[PDB]
From Swiss-Prot, chain A:
Location in or out of the cell: Nucleus
Note: Present with 1500 molecules/cell in log phase SD medium.
Organism, scientific name: Saccharomyces cerevisiae (strain ATCC 204508 / S288c) (Baker's yeast)
Name of the protein this chain belongs to: HDA1 complex subunit 2
Quaternary context: Heterodimer with HDA3. Component of the HDA1 histone deacetylase complex composed of at least one HDA1 homodimer and one HDA2/HDA3 heterodimer. Interacts with HDA1 and HDA3.
Family: Belongs to the HDA2/3 family. HDA2 subfamily.
Residues of the full protein shown: 543 to 590 of 674
From Swiss-Prot, chain B:
Annotated protein name in UniProt: Histone deacetylase HDA1
Compartments in which it is found: Nucleus
Highest taxon above the source species: Eukaryota
Protein's gene: HDA1
Similarity-based family: Belongs to the histone deacetylase family. HD type 2 subfamily.
Miscellaneous comment text of the record: Present with 3050 molecules/cell in log phase SD medium.
Function per UniProt: Responsible for the deacetylation of lysine residues on the N-terminal part of the core histones (H2A, H2B, H3 and H4). Histone deacetylation gives a tag for epigenetic repression and plays an important role in transcriptional regulation, cell cycle progression and developmental events. Histone deacetylases act via the formation of large multiprotein complexes.
Length: 48, 48
């Protein structure tokens, strides 16, 4: 019973930290993708 | 943590569609990246 309960708890902890990890990757992904988009726009006017 | 049931309108959709194409030789981009050297049957159009 205790084995089952502790596996549940560690899985719960992993699940709890995973969301915030995803959010952080999302945040820094937006940060870089901004500069990606503007650099694309520079290359666009160069094509023009 | 509703992560079993996320939103139906989802960013993940586009990738799977793009993925299935390169499984049939239509796209020669291996990492499933929207870059210029796609192949011979189609032609990527930039999105602004």
């Amino acid at each position: 019973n205790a084995t089952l309960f502790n596996k549940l708890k560690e899985l719960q902890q992993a699940n709890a930290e995973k969301s915030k990890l995803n959010d952080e990757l999302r945040s820094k992904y937006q940060i870089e993708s901004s500069k990606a988009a503007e650099s694309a726009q520079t290359l666009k006017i160069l094509q023009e | 943590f509703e992560y079993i049931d996320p939103h139906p309108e989802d960013p993940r959709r586009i990738y799977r569609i793009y993925k299935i194409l390169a499984e049939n030789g239509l796209i020669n981009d291996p990492t499933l990246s929207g870059v210029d050297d796609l192949g011979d049957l189609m032609l990527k159009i930039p999105v602004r």
